[PDB]
Amino acid sequence: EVRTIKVFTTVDNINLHTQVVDMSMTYGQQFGPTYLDGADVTKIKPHNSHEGKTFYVLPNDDTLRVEAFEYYHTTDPSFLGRYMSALNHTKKWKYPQVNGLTSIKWADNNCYLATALLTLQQIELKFNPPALQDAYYRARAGEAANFCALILAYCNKTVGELGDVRETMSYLFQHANLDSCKRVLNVVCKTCGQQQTTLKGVEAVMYMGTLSYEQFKKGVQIPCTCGKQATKYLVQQESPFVMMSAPPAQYELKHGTFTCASEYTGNYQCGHYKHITSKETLYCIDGALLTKSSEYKGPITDVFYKENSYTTTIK
Amino acid sequence: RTIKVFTTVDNINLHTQVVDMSMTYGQQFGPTYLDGADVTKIKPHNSHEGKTFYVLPNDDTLRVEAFEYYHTTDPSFLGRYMSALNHTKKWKYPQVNGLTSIKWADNNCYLATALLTLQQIELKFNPPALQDAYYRARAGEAANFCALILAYCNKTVGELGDVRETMSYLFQHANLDSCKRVLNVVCKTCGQQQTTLKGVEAVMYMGTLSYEQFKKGVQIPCTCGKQATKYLVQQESPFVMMSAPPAQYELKHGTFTCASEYTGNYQCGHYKHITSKETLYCIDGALLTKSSEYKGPITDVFYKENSYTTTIKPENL
Ligand SMILES: [Cl-]
Ligand SMILES: [Zn+2]
Ligand SMILES: [Zn+2]
Ligand SMILES: [Zn+2]
Numbered sequence: 177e178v179r180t181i182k183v184f185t186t187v188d189n190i191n192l193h194t195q196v197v198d199m200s201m202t203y204g205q206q207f208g209p210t211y212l213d214g215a216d217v218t219k220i221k222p223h224n225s226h227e228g229k230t231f232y233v234l235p236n237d238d239t240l241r242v243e244a245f246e247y248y249h250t251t252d253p254s255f256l257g258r259y260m261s262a263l264n265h266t267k268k269w270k271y272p273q274v275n276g277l278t279s280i281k282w283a284d285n286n287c288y289l290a291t292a293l294l295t296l297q298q299i300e301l302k303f304n305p306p307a308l309q310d311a312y313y314r315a316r317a318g319e320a321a322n323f324c325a326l327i328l329a330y331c332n333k334t335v336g337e338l339g340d341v342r343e344t345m346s347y348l349f350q351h352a353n354l355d356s357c358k359r360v361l362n363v364v365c366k367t368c369g370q371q372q373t374t375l376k377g378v379e380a381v382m383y384m385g386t387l388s389y390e391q392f393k394k395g396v397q398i399p400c401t402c403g404k405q406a407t408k409y410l411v412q413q414e415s416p417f418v419m420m421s422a423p424p425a426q427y428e429l430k431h432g433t434f435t436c437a438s439e440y441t442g443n444y445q446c447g448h449y450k451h452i453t454s455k456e457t458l459y460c461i462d463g464a465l466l467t468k469s470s471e472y473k474g475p476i477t478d479v480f481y482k483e484n485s486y487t488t489t490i491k
Numbered sequence: 492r493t494i495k496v497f498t499t500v501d502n503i504n505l506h507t508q509v510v511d512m513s514m515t516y517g518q519q520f521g522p523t524y525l526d527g528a529d530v531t532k533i534k535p536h537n538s539h540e541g542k543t544f545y546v547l548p549n550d551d552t553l554r555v556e557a558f559e560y561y562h563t564t565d566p567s568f569l570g571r572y573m574s575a576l577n578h579t580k581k582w583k584y585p586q587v588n589g590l591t592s593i594k595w596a597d598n599n600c601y602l603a604t605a606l607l608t609l610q611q612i613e614l615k616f617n618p619p620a621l622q623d624a625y626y627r628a629r630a631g632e633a634a635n636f637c638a639l640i641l642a643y644c645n646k647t648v649g650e651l652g653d654v655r656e657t658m659s660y661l662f663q664h665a666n667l668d669s670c671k672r673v674l675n676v677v678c679k680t681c682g683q684q685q686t687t688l689k690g691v692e693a694v695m696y697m698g699t700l701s702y703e704q705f706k707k708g709v710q711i712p713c714t715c716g717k718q719a720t721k722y723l724v725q726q727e728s729p730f731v732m733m734s735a736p737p738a739q740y741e742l743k744h745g746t747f748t749c750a751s752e753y754t755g756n757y758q759c760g761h762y763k764h765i766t767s768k769e770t771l772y773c774i775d776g777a778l779l780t781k782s783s784e785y786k787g788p789i790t791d792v793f794y795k796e797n798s799y800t801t802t803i804k805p806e807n808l
Pocket of ligand 1: 595596597598599600761
């Protein structure tokens with residue numbers, strides 16, 4: 177009456193669950209969306225050659241949901257489906273080594289993912305979700321399909337959409353161990369006094385308004401509550417890097433003064449990101465393309481700087 | 492022959508300047524606008540003393556001010572906003588059935604029905620520029636709101652636009668964080684698959700005008716070659732927008748909030764707005780028509796919502 181084979185199911189490829197499957201029913205009828213080595217097998221019926229194989233499935237019971245939470249650090253039931261949807265594309269991208277870093281050859285507007293991937297290889301950062309940490313290690317080795325698809329899933333973006341580097345880094349930093357990061361700022365306004373503020377976590381390493389770390393330390397002009405202009409400056413910084421962002425204009429990059437940067441060109445609604453890194457000179461990594469130059473000048477949107485512990489000497 | 496003026500990129504932070512009447516504004520400030528009019532090649536007049544001029548965000552401080560007000564980093568935004576505003580300030584914005592409309596001009600019908608729709612659904616804008624201008628538009632002064640819509644949509648005055656595209660751009664600048672949509676796709680061969688949409692995708696659907704049809708199920712292809720049934724499982728939003736290629740459709744009073752009618756084709760056409768009050772009202776720019784029934788080439792229908800959960804059992808499909 178009923179013929180069967182034994183297979184394994186998983187949501188993390190670490191915990192394997194024995195399943196006896198009915199060979200007269202499809203995998204989708206029995207498990208829902210089912211993948212065998214990234215290949216969609218939802219519509220097909222079990223075959224004798226499938227016996228003993230491991231199948232990815234979505235978390236549709238309590239055991240699988242706990243494992244998904246522990247591996248991906250998410251409770252969104254749609255997360256693994258969106259990751260698999262993205263992976264179907266990113267598994268076809270090429271991930272060349274460029275200047276010793278894993279880049280991504282351009283496809284489907286993935287330029288923002290390349291400069292994000294390149295940036296992460298240059299700043300000291302640990303990822304909390306085991307899925308992210310594992311996929312980052314594979315990406316550093318040149319096999320970044322899983323990492324890229326995770327990024328898309330964590331940001332709730334799909335292949336082809338315009339990505340923003342600042343927004344993307346912000347999502348990823350929420351899943352990094354940045355709790356020990358600290359920033360202390362002071363704002364000063366004639367006729368209003370002084371006031372200080374302490375930031376922690378992601379907010380302690382990201383700033384929007386100037387690309388220059390030294391300018392942030394010397395003071396930036398900001399509108400006050402009264403309506404006149406005031407001066408905000410960085411008092412103390414505890415973090416392994418800082419990210420400085422600004423609306424793009426024409427910014428000059430010089431060797432040895434920064435770690436890496438991102439540039440935005442083309443049509444503003446559907447444009448193009450490049451990566452600039454400081455090595456023994458400046459390299460512009462443009463997906464698979466590489467140029468070298470003494471200096472660089474353009475519509476820079478984000479600059480990353482190394483840091484450890486900073487304390488101001490101004491009063 | 493020198494006067495004081497204010498320059499700004501947001502009309503919030505005003506920067507005092509001294510100008511000389513012997514040179515143009517452009518030689519002193521770069522590109523300069525007075526109520527949207529390009530005054531770059533104009534010399535300061537006595538009557539300009541103390542007035543507020545827009546300039547381009549030409550330094551780090553101004554680019555911050557512009558970003559915090561408009562939520563854009565596009566360097567062309569201000570000039571495009573001002574170019575549109577020079578025109579929209581001359582449009583007329585009559586009250587039609589308690590709502591701010593727009594008298595027809597410059598193919599602005601798509602903006603009129605978008606504006607009429609926004610006044611009937613629960614929506615908050617995130618950019619202060621949009622918030623402030625929307626409050627003025629509700630009160631009848633819609634020139635700045637209409638020029639912002641054009642600038643955010645990268646449309647110029649006179650171009651025929653698209654309500655669905657326009658709403659997409661505006662919803663991306665709205666607070667939709669609490670909006671969630673869960674769908675189920677059921678195939679006789681493949682089984683079930685649920686999906687969760689957030690943000691603009693949680694409130695916009697393209698394929699059917701009827702919210703009730705979206706609840707009972709629409710037929711879609713399945714990669715196995717058969718037809719699958721797609722239906723709404725769960726909806727958390729204060730409204731929903733259902734769109735479909737324009738086709739003859741009967742709008743029944745009391746079954747919807749408002750809708751967009753489009754006569755024409757891909758190159759040229761005209762929008763009208765239909766709203767369901769104690770009866771059906773067709774708002775066509777400044778023109779109002781009342782009817783017990785309405786039938787037309789409908790392309791977008793808006794419905795009120797709060798929390799919906801399906802009663803379909805998948806095994807009963
Ligand atoms: Cl019109
Ligand atoms: Zn003050
Ligand atoms: Zn199927
Ligand atoms: Zn028209």
